[PDB]
Design a protein around this ligand. Sequence first.
Ligand SMILES: [Cu+2]
Ligand SMILES: [Cu+2]
Ligand SMILES: [Cu+2]
Ligand SMILES: [Cu+]
Ligand SMILES: [Cu+]
Ligand SMILES: [Cu+]
Lengths: 337, 336, 336
Amino acid sequence: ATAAEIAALPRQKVELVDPPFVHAHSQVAEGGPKVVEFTMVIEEKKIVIDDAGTEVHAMAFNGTVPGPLMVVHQDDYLELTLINPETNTLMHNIDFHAATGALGGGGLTEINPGEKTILRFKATKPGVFVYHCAPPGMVPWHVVSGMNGAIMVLPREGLHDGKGKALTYDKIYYVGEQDFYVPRDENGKYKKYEAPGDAYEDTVKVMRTLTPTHVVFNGAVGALTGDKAMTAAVGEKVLIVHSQANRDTRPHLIGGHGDYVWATGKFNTPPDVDQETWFIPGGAAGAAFYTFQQPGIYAYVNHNLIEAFELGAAAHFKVTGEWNDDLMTSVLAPSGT
Amino acid sequence: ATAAEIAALPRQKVELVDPPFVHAHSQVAEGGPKVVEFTMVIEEKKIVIDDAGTEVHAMAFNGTVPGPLMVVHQDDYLELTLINPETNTLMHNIDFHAATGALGGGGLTEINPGEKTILRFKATKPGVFVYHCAPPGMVPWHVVSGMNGAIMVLPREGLHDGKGKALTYDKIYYVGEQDFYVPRDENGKYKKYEAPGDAYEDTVKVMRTLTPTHVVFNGAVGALTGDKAMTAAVGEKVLIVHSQANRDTRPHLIGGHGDYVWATGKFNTPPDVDQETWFIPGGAAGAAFYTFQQPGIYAYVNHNLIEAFELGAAAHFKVTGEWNDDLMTSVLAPSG
Amino acid sequence: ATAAEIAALPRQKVELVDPPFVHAHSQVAEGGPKVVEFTMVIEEKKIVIDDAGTEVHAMAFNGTVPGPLMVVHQDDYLELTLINPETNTLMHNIDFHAATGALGGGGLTEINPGEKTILRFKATKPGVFVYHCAPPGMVPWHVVSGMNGAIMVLPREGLHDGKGKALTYDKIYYVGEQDFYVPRDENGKYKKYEAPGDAYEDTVKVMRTLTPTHVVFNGAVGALTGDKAMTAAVGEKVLIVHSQANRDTRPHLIGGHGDYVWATGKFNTPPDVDQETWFIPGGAAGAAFYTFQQPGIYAYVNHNLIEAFELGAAAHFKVTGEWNDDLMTSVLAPSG
Ligand SMILES: [Cu+2]
Ligand SMILES: [Cu+2]
Ligand SMILES: [Cu+2]
Ligand SMILES: [Cu+]
Ligand SMILES: [Cu+]
Ligand SMILES: [Cu+]
């Protein structure tokens, strides 16, 4: 398309919402291609990542870890206004794995504090894709400080399975998984720092171990639990988009399955089916579709169970509905031998 | 099925067999859905896992690491009687990744020492699936103490390739791969403990490094090598089911291939073919089908070769038959 | 085929070239099966792997890390003459993941310094496959000393997508990714040694931590950058073969994609499409096909960004051509 043709396209301004929720969208595209407009302000902020009060100097798109999910359709243009407020200290940019050229957009979006930029790219391929900051020479430090998220490029005809049949979810959640590398003192307690810069050298040492101290969903140990637990009902069809910008993960819905899993995150690659645990390589997003069949509490985890249960990578679902004894029943409840 | 239909289904008791062997089953299901009944007793016991006398306080379904492979067909029910003898000291349960609801069954099967429980679930999806103990708040500790196994839910018409042509194996082995995290004193010598709980804090410290001290098949370094190598013959079709309940693995048959590999372990997902090394993510089982073409010793490994050859993740196959010079020949033997 | 039949087949001698380049070949097979002949001399040499002068005692097929890519077609015979010069200190051999029998050839190719051998195997399965040295009892040591490479067995009709469409590349590059485990002194300075055997014990200690000190393409940090950046033009179709003989990797073309990715490396397993980041388990090779659409610098990385940008797993492409503003444009350049 020519500059003139793109200029003639409808514009739609979208208000982003904080993960794990996703902004209003239509699964099947409404009309022809549009220029979908998003704005995000970058916040360098202290966040607490566990119940002990452990701190990270986060670098957060839209003030959240992960950054919010942007949703467009194939062949729409994504037009992002990215703002680096003067209160920040570092240059930042954005790389969209969905985009083609200039390192994903990073080469064209390097903004110092007090600056902004607008990047437009054509979303040519359907799927879920990571985005993240990547300042040359400082790439993993920004990413493992939380400066990453994902986008979803839906097919114009909405989701389908591997074999032509339409798949329509009732609700969607975005689980961003984050590996953090928090320095420890001599007694093994996590260190605190006044400025982000003070943490750099110590953090790089931990990064080099390739062993995170924390692996978390939505920015903190237990972030998606309690009154923040995800919710569903028996019969409800849920799409769970999961991203990991730096490190492998192996999602698993404990008590459920991934009925259809685009493990590679790409909708033109047919989904795996009936999955127990799927695999998303670092630097990628994946998506799983499931119809809940049983009520009760589920844990959604990275199924390295040390990562899940020691390091923080566990969320909960609360599911309403009627128990199905055909699917599972306690024939004899725990009782003396 | 309605209540009366479920109640009317045949019930069949099956006797289990320790890994890497697999209990009696038919690949093609005989008659309709059945309630297939298994019993396992949980054993807590010290096991030695290497040639230096290194001990783990194992928590073992049916007394083995891994727990035994249970085999059913799609739309059968699996009905497990799980027993926790009063001689044990810990509460245990069971989560079947094949099952739906109550965390996989764990919510319904919490048994203290001196208790038993009976869980039934409908095996709705075909594949190999992990099962493991998962007491709330102590999940990885039970799992990396060896309290995990797998099941196979065969399609009612047996296995097929991507074109629906039948794949029938002559034999099946189950390789359960276990990451262990054994504490060491400050001289690097592995520590011993009187009771499993005494090792808890020290073991969690090792677990948090995400670096196993041992990675083993069938519960110990060399358990499936030497006089305990698995066997086959040239022309024989073998299914190798492989599980890892906590940590990634990358199986490889050295000298062979995975002709068909259900890498995700799920039979409705078409198998990969002609595989050199497949990948099974932590918390899953996979299955590879191979027809042996050459006699001799094979090694079967996790192809992180440090894990295979330094940490213990190496098995052997001893294969009989006639060498095939078309496939491979020594044109010039090693010579000066 | 019979020995007589094989003896009657055309021979072709191939001259290998250093990675990331690949020797001249045809994508669509030239006539019936051939015996394709390769020769490689093994060189034990010091390599410098970072800008701090860090040394590894490499064990290098054809003098390079990785060893060179050998290209044959399905049902050709690959016939390798492998030479271990008297200037070396260790026994070496070769295992082809593409081959069947004798551990992939290692059982038939054990050569001491001053010896040579000739191995012929039938390339029965199409795809990219790792090869590596594997001396019994010293396997990971040789592999993580850089003694590994890959081969490509092309379908006789060349590459295709999952649905019968031909895929013809204009350029091919072979990226061999290497995990190294370099000992450090009390001050964290990397240690140097004056013989390969001298480094063994210290190196094994590091290997057992499962944490590489370096993760590199083509034997060193920055190797495939600057004078060695890979090149292309807008419109050009490029195949990138990637191997890792010991450890997982997750390749990613920064600024591009994997349009078709044989993630398992096996051409009879349909390629994944539109890939952002793909996954190759340790002990395997994979291949990605991409048509460049934008000019400029791309980074090709292992997308654990710590491994890419702290440990060394980053390469570049320099691509010529016209910028496409439809695909991407700066609507407002960085500004107040
Ligand atoms: Cu990236
Ligand atoms: Cu589990
Ligand atoms: Cu190998
Ligand atoms: Cu940033
Ligand atoms: Cu247990
Ligand atoms: Cu060697």
